[PDB]
Subunit: 506 residues, 4 copies
């Protein structure tokens, strides 16, 4: 029913509307703002405005292609099918002029949309209306009717008047730059791709119009004996032969190849050729510019990784490091970053709490399932530890811990193997999902066995200040870490007295 | 009166003068520095200096266009209108040489302006004066007068001497690069735009001069039978026909199209053509360079947003995240930044206190009007809270708070809806302008109800260390937050005893 | 034995496999995942897959070169050696189609490899299979056999059908982009180098195919009197003469030089020429793009140093600094960075503990050998100091210390000379490997002698908060620093009483 | 005497030597390392090595220009002046081969210079020696002597052999890339400038050699009737006519203009032309690349300021700020940075203590002279305050202080005027060199008068934590600030009792 048509002129509820205004409670307020204004106003983001702009764009490219050819290569632009086509394609561009008095303008000053008739009618007439009117009315047929109540000059002047219809190109530029931002906001296609597909449309269009101009000036001069058409003896050839040749001549100038058969011979030809050369050669330089901007946007991640790693060689060479040590540094960069560039501490800081909580669970589900102390704890404790772990990598043969130092960290093994070493201990191994380094952080003493990486291993580490911050909020968990610690100190025979005293009569 | 003319040579009070010197008390000191020097000195930023440079620029472009044509395509450069024009356009360029002995030089060493006659007269004569003198005096008419007390060689040598007037191009370059910096400091037009509009002027000028040189060498050789003018049989054609052809030949070399009618046939033509090809092809490569520099400056913001967001996909793929979780991360980036790139904590830190105080009020006038605790407080308290809020966004279904955790934050709802959930509570809702999370920060206990986002919502958050820092300076406000808190704990039935005890007999 | 062949289809243990999966325990798990699937599956990183792709690439470039020539410049493509060659080079491209039903696809969604037959057969047939089948079967000989049970049109149509074999270019693009990533991950060649060597292959190939197309259309039209072959009178010349000319014509369009002998004369030639001009001129613009991307990647370090140092002149000119002070600042930047750009505090922070411990030893072995207090200490103390030193540089004549200030630092001399100055002290010198500034940090008092650089010297410095943090963990070392300090205070005669009292009866 | 010649082969003491090694004590050690080696060794940075490389470069460019012409355009390369010139220019390039067995190689591995004869003789013969020998000996005259004990083929083969002398270009490339780094380290000319002046040398040289090749192949074929020389009828013209034409043809291909008179007619010409087109068009694309790299390095500072300020408009538009507030923000950025981009807190942190102390005095000599409390203090106190000041700017009408707030800062007026306002106070003014805000920091109370900017003013500010840190080290200075404070509180009548009590009986 007609109420579904009355709903087509107000703003919609597609994801663009939500991105521009926020929640549905902002969209439904702006939707009433329209309905409570004057008798009809079209919202610039309405489905009606958007389908109208597509109907215009599809028809307007057709008109900017056909009109130059129908003016240039034909006599009798007052015959039946041309009178029908130019009348029909005048009405739609005149309805478009009417609807621009009743469309709400977006403001570059970032306000709410102007959305009122007395503001819109004043804002439009002070801008594009002078070009929009001249390009809409049939000035050539109006002039022909006024002059209707020797004669060959009238056919030349009405040809020159009819070319005012090319000013539609202003609407093609205005409607693309608005319609493009809606698609570019919603569908995320890259800047240089969109800019190139606009510029390829302009190159072909300027080239097509030049390929008409190069024949139109000879025609308005009545084919003088010195011009290219008369020297090539092609005044009476079919229109497709003449057009194919004039377009070849026009794009030969643009791509800088030559000028067709021979160099210009007359004054008109000389000055049309130079204008075409300048417009062509300055337009192809803008294409080389956009091609360069495209190519440099595509390798961004690879380039930034190379530009980062080249800076490490500046440091290694300034300190004059040995060639085997350079290899350990180069190899570590492959195992820690896998050729990808990012800054984890910068990205994780822009996300809110509940995304950061979800990502930091997914990286660690192997520990949470495999390791016994997390597997039965309250989930508000497990998320209090996993949010404070930091990620580290060790190469085979490196010591993570040495005996007789102090403090700072403990480690959980995400992947790989680490060995535990002490006097008279023989040897011992820790696999994936286990943890080490807790004794120094509980007892406040020195370290009691060395630990060494047996394969390329991924560890998560927890610092002494963060470890106490978690356990002070959950004192039931400290007893679990202590009742594991006292058992490990029994196997190694170290039997430390302060922890054994700290457990008694709990 | 004449004192208004004597005031024209000293520095003005337009916004450039204030930007260079600071307050009016610096400008009025420099204005006396001029007046207290020698009998007359012109300040380089004076309105007289600036209108004199415009009179020169407008006339100097006219001379560098007309002089090559009047030398090349004409005999009789001693006829009445040429004697009048070259005399008149000699006097202004000789007055310009006089005023450069009395203009204060700007120093590249960033000092005060040199502004003294014995320093200026020594600094000028050691630099451009040798080129400025040769380009100002009528050397060709002086030579013609000296030789005045078979003959065809004198007309050739006086043509070659008269081309010394093209050295004016040094003044055109010097005066543009100074005059441009005043406009570029005051009106803020972008680097590549200004640099392109300078280079387009040089391309057309070099092309025009080459289009004269290509005919001048044939003329000084008296049109030998092998040269392009004699082979094309155009020795006696009108000057406009000859010039249009010679310019077409010159720009055909620059844009690399061909060489006109046919390839060179003589020694002079061969070496003029190659010089023109090298100057042309190296000059068009600089245009492609500036076109590339322009295009890459225009998409800066879009590009940097793409280059930022591409780096998040490096992180999500390194951690091998699931495809539905990638969608939550992608969607959050659209709701928090709306496709715009900036760093709020870096920009706000460069502004002074009273700008930062004004911006942080404008973002929050909705809270300050709608919420009851700010609406009657002292404005020095309200500005003490709003300056410490941080901005956060939550997606629908995410928990902001869970029961049985601890501390850190409280939240004010700028836009959207949040629901409050607890055992036997049924359900409850908070709308725009309200606040939650205060109970944990006042009581120092654990949380007492969960809170969950019901629509895409914008929150401002306040941390526990900043919350106590404000309330310690305004103890009257803590009573308001507590007398709301005790009422909310009654509705949920939790009735916490420490806060109820803390209120008694105040 | 055949088990070594059955081992060729599973993943290997070369450094790429370790980089993709981690330790050998991840590789050996994926290696069983393959063996435990269906009867045969080829892993995409297998040595069999990689040698098969090389056999295809080497043969496929040969086919995309020979096929256009054998179709264009020859009659009798049913003669003995062509029947042998096209049959043989059909079988290998049909075995390749069979093995793509049994190769595990890599997933762009970063999962484990799909590695199952029912998933692979469904994923392939929904994508490239339609082009892979058409390019593999001998459609021209199949059509010739079907039609085998006036005639000149069949030879033209079988020429047009046989060009379906050029769709192999899709396999050449697919196989390069996978095979390249393995080499680019393992051997680290830069982005723009690899991208240029791909594009040079496409330029020569498009140019070769265009050089066939430019003759093929005349041949399919039976050499009409208006076309370039008939006007140049070369219908009966040897095939090498015709091909050399048609390739010259094709690359003349691509590099924008001309069009061979003369401009086109017929409708076919005009539209083939314009298509060749557009494909050529848009392809050469992509080469200028990649050449620009290469050149800007090579000077990265030099450029960034210039772009950094230019920013210091913005600061020195904003503060209007004197010209001799600018020279001290310029000279300091040469002695501290030696023209190399890096950020030491950012690089050292990405490395793990045991690399950072090794680099910070290598920079200081001169101190550890030459200076007496480190040379006999426990290595866990020496590594506790060297990990907290910071690096500084001083110009000759600058004071490092003044008498009568307080605290902050002490210094170790890596290289150069410093002099010690005090009232009635005469003069005194410290050489490489010595240290100064300890008295203020031990006694908590003020400084007691000035110190001044006598040559461009490199110092390591230690801050007062870090100095106490080390000595609190190793109280035996504080006695060494104190028993040196009390001896130095005796030579200068200052004899400070608090330190002398602090030593008694230890 | 000869000892001054023996000193020419060891390293010097010019600023490059100091930049590479550090102090003179490193240079004088390396200088002995040379003298204590084998009988003679040339150090690569010696004045002898550097003048020898200049003698080679100047002569080698002369040989790579003359040799192609003397081979191509002349018969009788065994005549008197050619035998003299080729013998002489063989000896110097053979002495150069001898001295490369006795020059110390720089190592790309950043070690000390290899500087020993058994290492150098092994390292050279495994690299460039094969090309250095072939390019040094007169192979053509050796072959002519061996063949010396119908004949026209010997003159063709000795022409082809004599072109081996062009391999000298390897020495021209090797010697430039070493000699350039010494100048580029010492004199600081920008990357793209140096790279362009190298590439312009290669363009002219390749173009010159191509202009010889284009005539040499016709000559070795004995001028066949189809080639360009015979069609242009110029077999007997003077050598300058032939060379000028062949160079025009060669650079017409490089700059893509045409191919001279007409398109190629024979097989040799066709394949020489295409090789010249490919070498030319790929070499001009590298010039457009370097021209783009030059132009983008020159506007670096202007561009970065625009790219910074464009990011502020992203922030102002995301918050939808009013248009008058945007103007205050835009205007503040002009008064605080004056269109220059830097980060003061990053630059000042890279300088050592005694530079940072000197710069921070020069910015403040106006305060230190004009203000009474600094003007008589100990210089170790004045440098303890000035090193902790921060710089701020305020627009006219903004409040710096409001009554009834608390703490944080005090201010010193570098330039401009500020007014002091209170109830019943009338009005009061502070000029340049005075200070305000001390009462709140001494008394720990609230503020007691408002302060407002009366002109665009520059302030230095000091924070409460830094203020107490200075005064605790210099308790005599706190009495000065207090004895000013108590006098100011008397003028305003506030008469605060805690400070008045704190002064009694000192
Ligand atoms: N026998 C053991 N079995 C397993 N782990 C042990 C054993 N003995 C010691 N450890 C661990 O080795 C760690 C070495 O560093 P810490 O002494 O701080 O803590 C030690 C324990 O976590």
């Amino acid at each position: 029913m007609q109420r579904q048509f009355t709903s087509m002129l107000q703003p919609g509820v597609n994801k663009f509307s939500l991105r521009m205004f926020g929640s549905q409670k902002a969209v439904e307020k702006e939707q009433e703002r329209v309905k409570t204004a004057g008798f009809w106003i079209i919202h610039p983001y309405s489905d009606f405005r958007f389908y109208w702009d597509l109907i215009m764009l599809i028809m307007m490219v057709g008109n900017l292609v056909i009109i130059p050819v129908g003016i240039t290569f034909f006599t009798e632009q007052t015959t039946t099918p041309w009178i029908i086509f130019n009348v029909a394609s005048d009405t739609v561009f005149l309805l478009d002029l009417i609807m621009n008095f009743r469309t709400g303008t977006v403001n570059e000053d970032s306000s709410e949309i102007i959305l009122d008739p007395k503001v819109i009618k004043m804002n439009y007439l002070k801008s594009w209306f002078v070009v929009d009117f001249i390009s809409s009315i049939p000035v050539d047929y109006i002039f022909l009717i006024v002059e209707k109540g020797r004669a060959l000059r009238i056919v030349r002047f009405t040809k020159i008047l009819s070319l005012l219809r090319l000013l539609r190109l202003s609407r093609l530029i205005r409607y693309i730059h608005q319609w493009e931002e809606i698609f570019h906001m919603t569908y995320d296609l890259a800047s240089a791709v969109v800019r190139i597909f606009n510029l390829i449309g302009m190159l072909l269009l300027l080239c097509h119009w030049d390929g008409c101009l190069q024949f139109l000036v000879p025609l308005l001069q009545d084919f003088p004996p010195d011009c290219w058409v008369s020297l090539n003896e092609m005044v009476n050839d079919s229109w497709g032969k003449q057009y194919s040749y004039a377009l070849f001549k026009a794009m030969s100038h643009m791509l800088c190849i030559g000028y067709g058969a021979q160099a210009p011979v007359s004054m008109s030809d000389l000055w049309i050729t130079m204008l075409s050369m300048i417009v062509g050669a300055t337009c192809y330089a803008m294409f080389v510019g956009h091609a360069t901007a495209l190519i440099q946007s595509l390798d961004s991640s690879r380039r930034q990784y190379q530009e980062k790693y080249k800076q490490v060689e500046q440091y290694m060479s300034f300190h004059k490091l040995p060639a085997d040590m350079r290899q350990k540094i180069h190899d570590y960069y492959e195992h820690r970053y896998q050729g990808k560039i990012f800054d984890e501490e910068n990205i994780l800081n822009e996300l809110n709490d509940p995304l950061r909580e979800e990502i930091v669970n997914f990286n660690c589900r192997k520990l949470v399932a495999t390791m016994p102390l997390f597997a039965n704890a309250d989930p508000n404790f497990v998320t209090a530890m996993l949010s404070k772990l930091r990620f580290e990598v060790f190469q085979p043969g490196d010591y993570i811990i040495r005996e007789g130092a102090v403090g700072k960290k403990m480690y959980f093994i995400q992947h790989g193997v680490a060995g535990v070493i002490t006097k008279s201990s023989k040897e011992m191994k820790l696999t994936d999902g286990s943890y080490f380094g807790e004794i120094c952080l509980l007892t406040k003493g020195r370290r009691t066995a060395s630990v060494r990486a047996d394969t390329y291993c991924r560890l998560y580490s927890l610092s002494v200040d963060n470890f106490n911050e978690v356990l002070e909020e959950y004192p039931m968990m400290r007893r679990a870490f202590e009742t594991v610690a006292i058992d490990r100190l029994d196997r190694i025979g170290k039997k430390n007295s302060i922890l054994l005293q700290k457990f008694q009569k709990d």
